Design a protein around this ligand. Structure first.
Ligand SMILES: Nc1ncnc2c1ncn2[C@@H]1O[C@H](COP(=O)(O)O)[C@@H](O)[C@H]1O
Ligand SMILES: [Cl-]
Ligand SMILES: [Zn+2]
Ligand SMILES: [Zn+2]
Lengths: 116, 301
């Protein structure tokens, strides 16, 4: 019945003014990539930074089980593209946002699927 | 310069041929720092320049490549070097990393413990080591060849590096081992590579390019380390981050290098020539299985 809710804790810590998790591993890249959210190699475009995935995963970084019956990680072993405006808090960004299952872009930060 | 636009500087061949005596390392630029791109860590920059240099050599790059990375943990609890290696290596490359202390990594598997506890059933195509103990930086004591993890690395290369494979092993003025230099003579080529971002340090990567499993040249490692320090002492390297801004040709080309299993009796001169050119890897192509030895103790009463 009891389960630690690390996601909620981080969200509330941030809203209270806590400093975001640091030392996410930022990659050098061309910044001419596809802009998709989570890729097997860095794919930042001009308005993103690319980061090693494990270092941007709340569960990896906090040393806690992944919220998934299999315990699989969406980010470990991949690269995550974060908008440059949100790159001060990659863990918060990946926690709060969702990837479009159709185009692989971040909902609201690249996904245009809901356009006319 | 010319040099400032490279990823770093490799020991020139003439310095390898000297017979110098070991001196203290006194670097002119000791305290200069490169200007890293915004938000980029030294370890990302260093590994990026190492990989840029390795792109210029004749590394074998087979399908289902196997790479192992020792000393991969940072005091931050993450693995920036592993992240760069995985970016550089072809997608799908099997990457294992290891460190004494716990860390989170993008590697396919990670072993925590002293490197001497690491065992692998399989052979590897590339071995990277950043292992280092900053206690060795004591200028008040004589600078002798070090054992510790270097003894492990030497045995690991001789036992588990595929013929044709390569290594890059981090050394410094005080963190070095004579047998490891001697083992560089068992490759088709070798050098000591200094990254331009960390050129203010006596750090280098000792790179062995295309392993032959036998001495091609006889190297005295005490002398060769003295030669390396002489080179560093007399050739100031300008700190530079210039190469970090051009990543268009960064990925390692998937060459599809051939892998064969062969018995010692079949390694003729034509095979040795293919190995020496980066055109062949010799090892089993079985599943990759690793383990860490764990010491068990019960401390109760
Ligand atoms: N015997 C050893 N086995 C495994 N890892 C080691 C050993 N000695 C040093 N290291 C690691 O090597 C890394 C050196 O990185 P640094 O100290 O940042 O240059 C550290 O993460 C150490 O834990
Ligand atoms: Cl943390
Ligand atoms: Zn994770
Ligand atoms: Zn979409």
């Amino acid at each position: 019945a009891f389960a630690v809710d690390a996601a909620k804790a981080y969200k509330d810590y941030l809203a209270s003014g806590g400093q975001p998790i640091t030392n996410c591993v930022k990659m050098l890249c061309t910044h001419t990539g596809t802009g998709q959210a989570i890729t097997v190699t860095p794919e930042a475009n001009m308005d993103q930074e690319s980061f090693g995935g494990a270092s941007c995963c709340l569960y990896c970084r906090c040393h806690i089980d992944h919220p998934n019956p299999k315990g699989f990680c969406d980010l470990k072993g991949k690269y995550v593209q974060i908008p440059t405006t949100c790159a001060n808090d990659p863990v918060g960004f990946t926690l709060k946002n969702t990837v479009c299952t159709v185009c692989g872009m971040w909902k609201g930060y690249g996904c245009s699927c809901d356009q006319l | 310069s010319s040099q400032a636009w490279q990823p770093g500087v490799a020991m020139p061949n003439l310095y390898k041929m000297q017979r110098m005596l070991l001196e203290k390392c006194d670097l002119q630029n000791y305290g200069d720092s490169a200007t890293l791109p915004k938000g980029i860590m030294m370890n990302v920059a260093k590994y990026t320049q190492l990989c840029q240099y390795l792109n210029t050599l004749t590394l074998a790059v087979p399908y289902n490549m196997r790479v192992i990375h020792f000393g991969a943990g940072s005091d931050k609890g993450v693995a920036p070097g592993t992240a760069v290696l995985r970016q550089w290596l072809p997608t799908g490359t099997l990457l294992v990393d290891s460190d004494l202390n716990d860390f989170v990594s993008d590697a396919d598997s990670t072993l925590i413990g002293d490197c001497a506890t690491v065992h692998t059933a399989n052979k590897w195509d590339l071995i990277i080591s950043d292992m280092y103990d900053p206690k060795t930086k004591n200028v008040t004591k004589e600078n002798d060849s070090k054992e510790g993890f270097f003894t492990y690395i030497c045995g690991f290369i001789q036992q588990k590096l595929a013929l044709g494979g390569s290594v890059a092993i981090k050394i410094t003025e005080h963190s070095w081992n004579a047998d490891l230099y001697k083992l560089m003579g068992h490759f088709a080529w070798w050098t000591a590579f200094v990254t331009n971002v960390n050129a203010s340090s006596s750090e280098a990567f000792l790179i062995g390019c295309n392993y032959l499993g036998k001495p091609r040249e006889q190297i005295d490692g005490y002398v060769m380390h003295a030669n390396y320090i002489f080179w560093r002492n007399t050739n100031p390297i300008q700190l530079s981050s210039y190469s970090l801004f051009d990543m268009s040709k960064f990925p390692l080309k998937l060459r599809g290098t051939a892998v064969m299993s062969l018995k010692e009796g079949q390694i003729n001169d034509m095979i040795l020539s293919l190995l020496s050119k980066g055109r062949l890897i010799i090892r089993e192509n079985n599943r990759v299985v690793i383990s860490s030895d764990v010491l068990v103790n019960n401390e109760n009463l």
